[PDB]
Amino acid sequence: KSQIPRLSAINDLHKIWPTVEEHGAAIIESFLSLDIVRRLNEEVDPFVKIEPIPAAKTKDHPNHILSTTTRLVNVLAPISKAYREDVLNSKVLHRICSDAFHVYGDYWVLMGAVMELAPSNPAQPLHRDMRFSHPIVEYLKPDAPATSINFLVALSPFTAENGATHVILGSHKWQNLSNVSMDATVRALMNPGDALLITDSTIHCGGAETTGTETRRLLTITMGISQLTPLESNLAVPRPVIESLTPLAQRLLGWASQRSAAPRDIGLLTIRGNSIEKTMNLKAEQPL
Amino acid sequence: KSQIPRLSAINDLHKIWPTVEEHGAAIIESFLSLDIVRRLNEEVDPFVKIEPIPAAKTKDHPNHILSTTTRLVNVLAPISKAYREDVLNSKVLHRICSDAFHVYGDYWVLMGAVMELAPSNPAQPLHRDMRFSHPIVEYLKPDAPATSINFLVALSPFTAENGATHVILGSHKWQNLSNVSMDATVRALMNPGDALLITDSTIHCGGAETTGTETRRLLTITMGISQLTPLESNLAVPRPVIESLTPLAQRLLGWASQRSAAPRDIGLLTIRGNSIEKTMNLKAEQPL
Ligand SMILES: COc1ccc(C[C@H]2C(=O)Nc3ccccc3C(=O)N2C)cc1
Ligand SMILES: COc1ccc(C[C@H]2C(=O)Nc3ccccc3C(=O)N2C)cc1
Ligand SMILES: [Cl-]
Ligand SMILES: [Cl-]
Ligand code: NI
Ligand code: NI
């Protein structure tokens, strides 16, 4: 069985989305530089350490799906300069997203999260993303272009023994799911900064951590059309932080109006014919 | 040909959504009281008068579809006490919406707008709503439950001669649109406070104003699943105004997290497992 296609962020940029459209997955080698990975890790480190269990009794939106040995930290913009500057303005990410979502229009971040898997973390069941948040997605026609995609960026090594992600190539086109099995999977073996890109229809799962010693960390960036509601809110992010961002980063975090691809688009999140950013006089690229 | 079913807001409440599901339209008699209509009208009056043309060159999200003799005012919460208190907490609206959207989960306001049509306003072409903002909707399967519905509330009389809305009954189930014609329509003749309820698949249009003297006004409330992005933003609505609302009204305006109907729902617009309202310590029902 064939392995996940591996592509250069530098050289093969136009090939990335077409590869994912055909095969359901691709590995983007050095999607983030080692420097960006270093800074991201350093900045999110304490927030991962203080994060409670996914279904903590203190939470009013507990995640009952993730293993108790998973820590997920989202709303990364206030935590991480590297995320809000380097990642949110990634040339590679934006080329891929504009390739993927041109039929629909603007896209934004549905969720940007750091996930840390503890040693001995079990494999997840094979799944498609979005089914615990967006029931609408299951009602889309088979040939509907993907309305979200997920960049699974390695922040530490992904190996077969420490639980590297499994994917079933071609499974994004499957209607009948009788042949869903771990027998059909291949692995996303990745160095820090490499990213596995999948669609919302790609069948996949986190792998089993079998060493009992290694802690695997990733940055999962679910990008989706601006017509779908994000899993996370940036409403509470301080205005100085938002005003330090590029206009593009502001749009990605829901601090701007959005546009569809309809020929005479009337827009999303508008205010009496004007944008959020025009109405609120929102500044951009103002240093803290 | 059969007329639009007419139902009591008081007596026939459980019958309203089933009627719309079957026929694609229903008239809810006295959906709003005359007092609520009076107050709504008085409060929005000046904002309608100052509103420029839909495609005004000053706007960065111009509406190129609406006639130049239409004035549309959205983001009504800061304008109208009657809207944000009486309409957003309407028992009838919420019963209908929970009936309609139970398969998907929470719902919210995609757009609440007052539309005023000037004398001699031409009939709109027959259409389905949502096609200039949510291209995703066209890619839903035929049997997908409606993901949005539109309450067209009369704020002045709707008569055949002054441009009362046309609908084609049953057209919400149409796949082939070869028989789309004004020959197939019936009219929504309505007194102030009556509402025509349609789905996002009901084929309909505003009628021709033929008197040259009458100004027709309506309140259009597009309610949709919380998984779809609103056409309008309440991000710039002052916090004192938001904190005067009920928790339900806050949710409807995007000042709360949202939930899907998935058995182990992980939520929408959350912040590290907690809600917007918990995170921001958002007060409710605090008088101005
Ligand atoms: C333990 O087995 C699992 C089964 C299904 C899922 C799906 C997933 C999702 O739909 N979206 C995301 C996307 C990014 C990060 C986390 C999640 C997330 O929480 N779930 C539930 C996760 C785990
Ligand atoms: C002039 O002919 C027309 C053709 C189509 C439409 C559709 C409509 C929409 O999709 N949504 C709404 C919903 C509530 C109020 C206004 C609108 C709105 O602006 N358009 C464009 C309007 C007019
Ligand atoms: Cl994984
Ligand atoms: Cl109308
Ligand atoms: Ni997944
Ligand atoms: Ni319409």
Residue numbers in the entry:
A (entry chain A), B (entry chain A): 8 to 295
The authors write:
In order to strengthen the π–π interactions between the non-methylated surrogate and the protein, we replaced the Val-72 with a somewhat larger isoleucine residue, followed by new DFT calculations and classical MD simulations. The wt and V72I-, V72K-, F139I-mutated AsqJ variants turned out to have similar turnover rates for the methylated substrates 1 and 1b, suggesting that these alterations do not lead to a significant decrease in the enzyme activity. On the other hand, starting with the synthesized desaturated intermediate 2 of the methylated natural substrate 1, the activity assays show similar turnover for the wt AsqJ and the V72I variant.
The non-heme FeII/α-ketoglutarate-dependent dioxygenase AsqJ from Aspergillus nidulans is an exceptional enzyme that activates dioxygen and stereoselectively catalyzes a C–C bond desaturation and epoxidation reaction. AsqJ converts its natural substrate, 4′-methoxycyclopeptin, to a quinolone alkaloid, 4′-methoxyviridicatin. The active site of AsqJ forms a funnel like reaction chamber, located at the interface between antiparallel β-strands. The substrate interacts with the active site metal, which is ligated by His-211, His-134, Asp-136, as well as by the C-2 keto group and C-1 carboxylate of α-ketoglutarate (αKG), and a crystallographic water molecule in an octahedral coordination sphere.
